[PDB]
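Hello,

Following up on my earlier ticket. Below are the four sequence lines again, exactly as submitted.
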Amino acid sequence: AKKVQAYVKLQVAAGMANPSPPVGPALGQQGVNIMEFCKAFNAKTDSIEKGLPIPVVITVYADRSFTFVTKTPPAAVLLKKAAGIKSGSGKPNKDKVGKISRAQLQEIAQTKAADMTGADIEAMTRSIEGTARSMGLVVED
Amino acid sequence: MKIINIGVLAHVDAGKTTLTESLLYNSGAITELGSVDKGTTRTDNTLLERQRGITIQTGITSFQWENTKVNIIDTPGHMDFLAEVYRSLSVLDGAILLISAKDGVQAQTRILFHALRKMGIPTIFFINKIDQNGIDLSTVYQDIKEKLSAEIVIKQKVELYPNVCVTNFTESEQWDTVIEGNDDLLEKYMSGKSLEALELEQEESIRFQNCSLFPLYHGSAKSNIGIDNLIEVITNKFYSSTHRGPSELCGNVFKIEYTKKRQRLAYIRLYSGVLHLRDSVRVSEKEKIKVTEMYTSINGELCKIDRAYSGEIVILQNEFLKLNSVLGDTKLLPQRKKIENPHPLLQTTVEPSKPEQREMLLDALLEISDSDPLLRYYVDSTTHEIILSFLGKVQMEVISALLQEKYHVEIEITEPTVIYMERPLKNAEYTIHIEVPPNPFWASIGLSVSPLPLGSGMQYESSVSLGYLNQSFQNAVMEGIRYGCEQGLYGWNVTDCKICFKYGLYYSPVSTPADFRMLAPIVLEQVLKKAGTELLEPYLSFKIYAPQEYLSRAYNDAPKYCANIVDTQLKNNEVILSGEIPARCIQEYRSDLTFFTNGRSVCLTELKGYHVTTGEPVCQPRRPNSRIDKVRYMFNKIT
Amino acid sequence: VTSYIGGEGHNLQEHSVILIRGGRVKDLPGVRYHTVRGALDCSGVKDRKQARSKYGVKRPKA
Amino acid sequence: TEFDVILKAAGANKVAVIKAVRGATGLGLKEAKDLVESAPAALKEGVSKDDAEALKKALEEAGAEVEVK
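Thanks for your patience. The regenerated structure is below:
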């Protein structure tokens, strides 16, 4: 389990094959080819829904290519299609931009549990639901 | 008979051209001063050369050794205007670059060393300044292997100390890997057993023709140890001269300089045959052009000769001589060339001093075209501002120093034309009126310019219906609108035009097609006043290559540069990135890669994208316009 | 002298040494000469056809 | 993946072995020839069996012997 070397968690939507206006040089900052982030980046994207920004480990090695393990998309972009509104924070406590409820957000929580580190599902419920409070959203308990 | 010309690739101010002056003493005398420290003769030639510490252009001197001719010239490696040294590669297939003793061969010489591969002619490294402290007697020589990027090995090596052994080597046991590549030498390696090194010199002689590896060399010329015996190898290692005399004679020009005592002399090597003195010959102009005089360029002094040998190179006077002109025709040789990869290395103004004496300086600018061929200039600007194609910092000093001696004029300029392309900010109603409120001509039309996306250029359409649009007179309206696109109210050139003309009442008995052309220009200066002005500047992209270790230092230059970041990809140890910065500040970008790059910097770009726009104040360059009919009436429109 | 520039346009600017022929223009005051188009750096008028011996234009290649 | 790549002999095509060994470590042709006189000797150690199988199979085209380890 080697520590830090060159890996980063930054790329936009998974449906955007071979990004450049977003990431651009940042992924090409190492010796890895720009072609590596579309021909292989989509090899796992095809398994699930396209267009969802999913972070992935990029542990570059001297031997041309690199190992990688896909993770879980952030809950911020998850609060769009499942929340209706594409907006978020900006005006948190000053006004209610939207609201969902605990019956639904807790139902999505265990799908992300494969990446989350929690002793119990209830402990991982409010840590995700508490991120929507930063958005000004008011969960319906 | 003859002999190939020796090289002189003293890259990064290696002073290997100053080692050539020591070779003239070894070929001496029987009567010569023997050279001296500093300047110093050594075929210095033009004035203000050795006083500058380095020659303004590559020279030449006569010499011989081993019962063979051994012409050579140096250095051309200073700066800065190194493309001129590329023209000397045609003077001789030989090479003899002097790698520096400080950290291996200088990186600027690696560009001239990689250019030697494109020549297709052999070259050899030499241990210049071997008698000095910090020299890489066993460490820096390994750096020439990493920089050579091949398998060249020295034929001898020593470490000192007062000793300067050279023949004691070399490359025992392991040496001879180049023979392994030979189809014949690789078969002798299969037989095994020891063999004489002269036997491997035949297979190395085949590989020397392909220039597969630089011949070995060592010993600084200042120590006077190995600077003469190593010169004997140039006689045997150099390729034999292509003697013939069978005819018909052929050749091509190589270089020329406007000597004050000349006044002209376009020297050129004889590719084949020989030219009798005072006899006509063929040329590229397709006319007769006898050589009335010609002489060999002796290192100690010029010397006439009744006829050049075959394969020789010597100056000769003529009434005219285009650069690279066939002495046949025609020469049949092919090679790659470039002016250091730069169509324009930061143009700078050089307006001459004095209201009249500056004009005679313009004719001296034609004399710069008689010198180095990598030079160009044109008065494209309406002010006739100078725009020389020469680039580099120290290289400009020779062009400025030349003005203080060869002529009597000088100038200082650098900003250049701003290249503004102002566009209207928004579309607005306008009209030239009707009848005679009013001023000439009585014909009028209501121009209605509108905004357009950047880079779309000028546009117009004939909205008026016939016959009032005029099948013939309506075209003057467009030709007259174009007169108003030569400059806006701030004098900036018209951009993003979209003048869709509409109303155009006119009286027939007094109307003329010039009358509509005249009122049309006023519709463009009135409708441009409603635009409120919109200054914009070009922002062409400028890709550049920098070493990855210094690549992090190139991001600091980004905040100072007006350009925004762009995509780039690494390429092994080399690195590059796609920039895009405005041309007003792009000329200063070259200074940034010469410093932060440490000499490894390299870049290239070209103008593109009319869109830009930047602050502040929206300054404009006067003035537009004058020397045109009815121009004083546009002043009445202001009030 | 202030010789008139004949033909349609010219590449001349500021200096540009040119040959000068005689003959008054019978129109511009102060002018009694004509510029020799097609001589020296004074290039001839583009795409001339009839009367091309004047202005120095050459016989077309096509 | 650390099989030996010992070379028992250069074989009847010992000249061809000098190229397969020279490209096996970037060693010089002079040392690559004295190593032929140093036979038997390992050409490499710790290398993956996928790599040494290519350098060994190339020795089969030269008629030379090899000894995997």
